[PDB]
Design an enzyme around this catalytic site. Structure first.
Site, PDB file in Angstrom:
ATOM      1  N   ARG A 117      45.459  34.235  40.314  1.00 31.34           N
ATOM      2  CA  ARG A 117      44.834  34.932  41.424  1.00 31.34           C
ATOM      3  C   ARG A 117      45.763  35.053  42.614  1.00 31.34           C
ATOM      4  NH1 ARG A 117      39.262  35.296  40.262  1.00 31.34           N
ATOM      5  NH2 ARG A 117      38.047  36.684  41.631  1.00 31.34           N
ATOM      6  N   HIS A 134      44.486  42.179  42.468  1.00 30.27           N
ATOM      7  CA  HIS A 134      44.138  42.076  41.046  1.00 30.27           C
ATOM      8  C   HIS A 134      44.901  43.054  40.130  1.00 30.27           C
ATOM      9  CE1 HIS A 134      41.189  39.047  41.300  1.00 30.27           C
ATOM     10  NE2 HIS A 134      40.168  39.622  40.693  1.00 30.27           N
ATOM     11  N   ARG A 161      46.843  41.543  37.193  1.00 28.02           N
ATOM     12  CA  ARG A 161      46.110  40.889  36.116  1.00 28.02           C
ATOM     13  C   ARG A 161      45.572  41.938  35.149  1.00 28.02           C
ATOM     14  NH1 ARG A 161      41.598  37.859  37.634  1.00 28.02           N
ATOM     15  NH2 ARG A 161      41.673  35.833  36.572  1.00 28.02           N
ATOM     16  N   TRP A 203      39.729  33.775  32.351  1.00 29.05           N
ATOM     17  CA  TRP A 203      38.427  34.439  32.344  1.00 29.05           C
ATOM     18  C   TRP A 203      37.432  33.725  31.421  1.00 29.05           C
ATOM     19  CZ3 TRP A 203      42.567  38.338  32.379  1.00 29.05           C
ATOM     20  CH2 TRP A 203      42.586  39.124  33.532  1.00 29.05           C
ATOM     21  N   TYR A 207      38.525  46.163  31.628  1.00 26.48           N
ATOM     22  CA  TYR A 207      39.916  46.433  31.965  1.00 26.48           C
ATOM     23  C   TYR A 207      40.667  47.249  30.917  1.00 26.48           C
ATOM     24  CZ  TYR A 207      39.430  43.260  35.966  1.00 26.48           C
ATOM     25  OH  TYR A 207      39.019  42.672  37.149  1.00 26.48           O
TER      26      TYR A 207
END
Lengths: 317, 323, 317, 323
Positions: B155, B271, B274, B297, B306
DNA sequence: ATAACTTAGTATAATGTGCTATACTAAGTTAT
DNA sequence: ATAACTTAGTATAGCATACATTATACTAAGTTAT
DNA sequence: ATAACTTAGTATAATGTGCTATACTAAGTTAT
DNA sequence: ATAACTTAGTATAGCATACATTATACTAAGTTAT
C-alpha cells in the site's frame, strides 16, 4: 427479579445443553468478576456497565490477551442475556471500551498465536525414530500422532474414539467414526479414513495394549511405567495427556524448551491440525478438499492456518 | 431523555479511541454537511428526523454525488444516532424507501465506479527508461519508489511506514525488504518482499544518494528539497500526498497536463501500481494463491475487478464459441 | 387507519424504489381483486382472510397457474405489509389454502414451464442462413442472437446496453458493461465478453445501423421496412420486439406454430439463457463457471435449466 | 380466546388437504402419544405447557427414542400450536433448553443413525443365480422387481405406481421404461429408464407369466397368490409393504432368520437397492452428474453418506500420506 | 520412589453493512 | 518567489470486527500402580 | 397499405426446520 | 389352516415450499415512416 431468578434456575437445570467448558469458563469469569467487585465495593449482578468497563480496562492493564478480555465480556454477556437482563455489551460504555481495548492492544502489536505446526516431515522423522521401539508408550504415541495428522481431529475428538468406532475399507484402510466435534453434534457425523501406514501403526497399538478386548473401550488409554496398558470404557486419556505426547515427542527431537515461558515453543494438541492443513495447501489440495479434511464449514480458519518471491519472477528475467 | 443522550455523547468521547482518526474525520465531515443543510433549510440537525434525512439524501443525489457517498452520509448519521441512543434514520421507512430508490435511479443513469489507471510493466519499463540516466536525486528516489511499488504490491500507507534495516542482502547478492501489513488478531505480523536487480538495485542508488539508515529510525523514503537534497528522517513519515504525487507527477512528466473534464482517475494514483502487477500477474499465468498473496488481498472479489477486461478472463461461453 | 393512509402514501411517493413491473403487477392484482370484491359485495381493503381465501380458490377454479395465484397473494401481501397491516398470509385460512391449491394443482400434473432452448446448434444453423443477408434487420437480429447466447443476458438487460458500454480486450474481443440486472443493482456490475465471431457480428451491426454515431445511443434500435435503422439515446427497442426476433427466427427455420396456443412453441426472450446454460453443462463446464456466465448467485435455477442410460452401463457388460 | 383457537382448528380441517396423509398420520400419532402421557401424568394436553412438553421430551429420551424421533414429536406439537394460534412450545426456554441437552446427551452415548444394508451387484448376481432357473411365478416376478430396483434406482412408492405401456423396445431390441418422479412446480414430469438384457428381459418373463398390459391401467407388478397365480390389476397398487418385503423375504431366503437383536436394518429394505447402485456407481468411476441423476437426488449430502466407507472416498490426507 | 498420569484453575484460541482507507482539491508551511 | 512538501476537508473505494459459544494451552498440584 | 414496431394488460416464470417419506411391528383380510 | 398380501400405528430418514419481489410470455391494439 423473580423472573430473573427463575431464568437462571432454568439455565442451571438444563446445564448439559452447554459444553462442560462453557460452564467452567462461565464460573471462572464470574469468579474473577465477583472478586474484582468485592475489592471495589461493587454489585456483581446485575452488572453495571460502568463497572464492567472498569473491569475490562482492569484486565487489559493486567496484561491479559484481547481474546481473554473478550471471553470475560462474553461470559458476563451470556449470564445477563440468559437471565433475561440486558447485556453489558448493550451499553455504549462497554461496547466502545471493548473496541478500544482491541484497537489499542493490536496497534501495539499483540497477535493471536497459533500452534506450532506438526507436518509430514515432522511425522516422518518422528516415525523414523519411534517405529523401532517395542515400548507400549512409544507404540501408543506413534499411533496417536499418526491419527492426529491423518485425521486432523482435535485432541478431545481423539480421546473420545471407542474401539467400536473403527471400521474398515475393503482396501484394508482403517475408518474412524466421529460423532461430536466442536462445530458439530449429531447421530450422523463423519468417518475418518486412515492411510495404510497409519492403519498399521494403529493396529500395532491395538495388539499390544489389548484395547479391542471390549469394543466400548476408548481406543487410547494410559500406559504405566511397567509398560502395562490400562484399558477403560468409562475413562478417557486426558487431553492434558494427549498434549503431553506432542510435548514429549518434540522434546525427543529438539530437547528442552526456552526459558521464556511463552506459549507454542513445542508442539501442542493442535499442531497436527495446523500442519496437515498447511501440508495440504502446499500440495495444491483444493481448499474445498482441505475443509472436508478439517471438518470446517467456513473458509477463514482454513485460510488463516497458512500464509507465508513469486511476483519477483516476471520482472526478474 | 437529554441526560441519556448526553451520557451517550460522553461515552463516545471518553472512548473515542474505539474508532480510527479517519472514521472520526468522516463522522465530523458528514455532520458539518448535514448541519449546514439543515440550517439553510431550517431543520433541526439533532435528533435527525426521517423526512429531513430523506430530503437531505435527495439533496446529495441532486448534488450529483455517488451512491457510495450518499451511503457514507447516511452511515455516519446512523452511527451518530446509534451511539446517541436515538433511533437510526435508516430504521425509518421514508429514509429506507428513499435510499432504495436513489440506488436504483442512479445505476439507471450510468453510475460507474472508478477503478485505477493501471500502472503495469509497459509503464515501469517506460519510466525507468526515461529516468534511469538522470542524476537528479529526485528522479533517483522516485524510480526506486515506483520500483518497489510494482515489484512489492504494498500500500501507499505501507511503503512510507517502512524504515531502513528492513533490507538485507541475504537473498543472495540481491535485496529482500522486511515488512508489516496487518491489523487483526488472528491476522499477521510481517512479510519478506524481494526485488529484481532492478527494484532492489534502483533502491541502492536511493540508498547511495539519500543517506541510508545512518539512523534506522530513518524511514526508507524522505523529502528531497528544491536543492535536490534529501532530509533523511528517522522520525518523520513521507506524507501519503507526496507518495501519491510521485505517481501523479510521473504521469504528468509523460502525458503532462494530467487530463481534463473534472473527473476521477485521469492519471496514476496510489493503487495504480497494484492493479498493474495484478493484471500483469494475470497475463503471465498466475494462480490465485499467488495473486491474492502478492497484494495481501483477503478476498477474490476485488482482484477480479482488476483483471476483468483481460482476454484471459473472457469466460466459458467465449471458450465454447471458439472451440 | 391514518397511520395506514400515510404508509401507503409513503410507498407511492417513493415508488421508484421498486421495479416498474412490480407496480404494474401490484396494480393488476388490486384490479382483479377489487373487481372480484365488488361482484361479491366485499371490502377490498383491508382484505378479509376468508375473502382472500375465496379469491384464491376462485383464481384456481379459473384455471390459473399456481405461480399466477401466488403472484396475486404476493401482491395483496405486500399491499398489506407495506401499509403496516397484517398480511392475508398471516392467517391460517390463507396460508393453508395456498398450500392446498399448490398441492392439488401439482398432484394433478401442472408444472412450471421453461423456455424452449436456443442452443449452439440453433445459433450455428441460424447464423449459417442469415450470415449472408445484407438486410439491416437480419444483420441486427443475428448480432442480437449472438449476444443473447454468448452473454446469456436477459432481453431487458440487452435493450439497456448503450454504445458507450462496449469496450475491447487487447485480443480484439468485445466487452459489454452491464449495470443493473434482475438480481443486481450497482455502479459496479459485470463486463460481458464476446467471442471473436460474435464481436464480428456486432461490429457489422454497428457499421450498418450507424448506432455508434453517439455513444449514448442504445446498441439495439428499430429498423423500418425501407431497411433504415433509427438510432436513439432515449428509447430502447421494446423487449416485446426482442422477443419477436426469437419468434421470427424460429418461424424462419421451423415455420408457423401449433394452433394449440400453448406457451413455449417457439423460441422466446429466455431461450438463449436456458440453451447456453445447458450447452455449458454438456461441455463439462463447472457449475461455478456456469453461474458466473449466467450471473446467478445460487445453484437451483442453474441446476433446474437442465436434467434430461448411464447406470445401465455397468450391468450391461 | 377459545373461539380464536376453535376457528383455527376449523381452518385446519377445512383445508386439511394442505398436508399429506403421512403428515396427518404422524400429527395424530404424536398427539395420541402426547395425550396419553399427559393423562397418565395428570397434565393438560392442550394447550401444551412448557414444563410439560419438557417433562414429556425427557420421557421420550428415557424411552430410548432417537433424537430425530424426539424432534418429530416436538415438531408435531409445534405444528399443532402454530396452526391453533397458541404459542409453540419450542418457543419456550425450558423446552428449548431441554432439546439442546437431549441432542448432545444422546450423541455422547452413541446415537448412531442407520443407513441401509446395501444391495449391490454382488447381491443381484447372487439372487439372480439362485432364482434364474425357478419356474415359480413368484421368483420370476421378484427377480424382475429386484432387477429394475438395481438398474433403475427408483423409489419403492415409484416402482409400484408404474403401469405397463411405460415400456417400449425403441431402445433397440432392448427395453426402456417410461416414468414420472417429481412433485414440485419448476421440478419435472417424467424420465426414460433402460435396462440390460437382464433387467428388461428378466421383466419379459414377468410379462410372459403375469398377464401383461391386457389393460394398461395394469400396474406392472401385482400380487401372486399361494397358487402361484397373478392378479394383474389395472387399478390396484402393490402395497409398499409387499414391495419392501421382496427385499426382506429375499434376504431371508439367503441368510434366513432375518437376524436378531431387536434393531433397525438387519436385512434389505426398500432403499437397499439404491444405496447399492450408488456405492457401485462409485467404484466404477462415476461422476456426480451421473450419480445424482441416477437416484434423482437433488443434493450431494445424502449420496456421499452412502459411499462414505469407500476406498475411493478416503480423502486428501490418505492420498498425501501414500504419495 | 516414581512414571505417568488426572484434576483444576486461569489464560487464550477457534468456529458454526459498518468501519477505515484512498483520491482528489485546495490551501498552508519551509527552506532554498 | 517557488519547489516540495503537509495538512485539511470531502468524495469515494475497499475492507473485517462482534455474537455466542466451545475448545485448546499452560501451570500446578494431586493420585496410583508399581 | 404496411412493416415493424410500441403500448398495455393479464398470465406466469425466476431469483437474490418443517413437511413427507420409509422402516419396521403387528394385526387384519382373501382366497387357496 | 396358511400364503400373500393390506392396513395400521409409530419410529426414523430424507427431503423442498413460502418470502418478496422483478422479470418474461402472450394477446391485442395502437402508431409512424414510408
Amino acid at each position: 427479579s423473580d423472573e430473573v431468578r427463575k431464568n437462571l434456575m432454568d439455565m442451571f437445570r438444563d446445564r448439559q445443553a452447554f459444553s462442560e467448558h462453557t460452564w467452567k469458563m462461565l464460573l471462572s469469569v464470574c469468579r474473577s468478576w465477583a472478586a474484582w467487585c468485592k475489592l471495589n465495593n461493587r454489585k456483581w449482578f446485575p452488572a453495571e456497565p460502568e463497572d464492567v468497563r472498569d473491569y475490562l480496562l482492569y484486565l487489559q492493564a493486567r496484561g491479559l490477551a484481547v481474546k481473554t478480555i473478550q471471553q470475560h465480556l462474553g461470559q458476563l454477556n451470556m449470564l445477563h442475556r440468559r437471565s433475561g437482563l440486558p447485556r453489558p455489551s448493550d451499553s455504549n460504555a462497554v461496547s466502545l471500551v471493548m473496541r478500544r481495548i482491541r484497537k489499542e492492544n493490536v496497534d501495539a502489536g499483540e497477535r493471536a498465536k497459533q500452534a506450532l505446526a506438526f507436518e509430514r516431515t515432522d511425522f516422518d522423522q518422528v516415525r523414523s525414530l519411534m517405529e523401532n521401539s517395542d515400548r507400549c508408550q512409544d507404540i501408543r504415541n506413534l499411533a496417536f500422532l499418526g491419527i492426529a495428522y491423518n485425521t486432523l481431529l482435535r485432541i478431545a475428538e481423539i480421546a473420545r474414539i471407542r474401539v467400536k468406532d473403527i471400521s474398515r475399507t475393503d482396501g484394508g484402510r482403517m475408518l474412524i467414526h466421529i460423532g461430536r466435534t466442536k462445530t458439530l453434534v449429531s447421530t450422523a457425523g463423519v468417518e475418518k479414513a486412515l492411510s495404510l501406514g497409519v492403519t498399521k501403526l494403529v493396529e500395532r497399538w491395538i495388539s499390544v495394549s489389548g484395547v479391542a478386548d471390549d469394543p466400548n473401550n476408548y481406543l487410547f488409554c494410559r500406559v504405566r511405567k511397567n509398560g502395562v496398558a490400562a484399558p477403560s470404557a468409562t475413562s478417557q486419556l486426558s487431553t492434558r495427556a494427549l498434549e503431553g505426547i506432542f510435548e514429549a515427542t518434540h522434546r525427543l527431537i529438539y530437547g528442552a524448551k526456552d526459558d521464556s515461558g511463552q506459549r507454542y515453543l513445542a508442539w501442542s494438541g493442535h499442531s497436527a491440525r495446523v500442519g496437515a492443513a498447511r501440508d495440504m495447501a502446499r500440495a495444491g489440495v483444493s481448499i474445498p478438499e482441505i475443509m472436508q479434511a478439517g471438518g470446517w464449514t467456513n473458509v477463514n480458519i482454513v485460510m488463516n492456518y497458512i500464509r507465508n518471491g513469486a511476483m519477483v519472477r516476471l520482472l526478474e528475467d
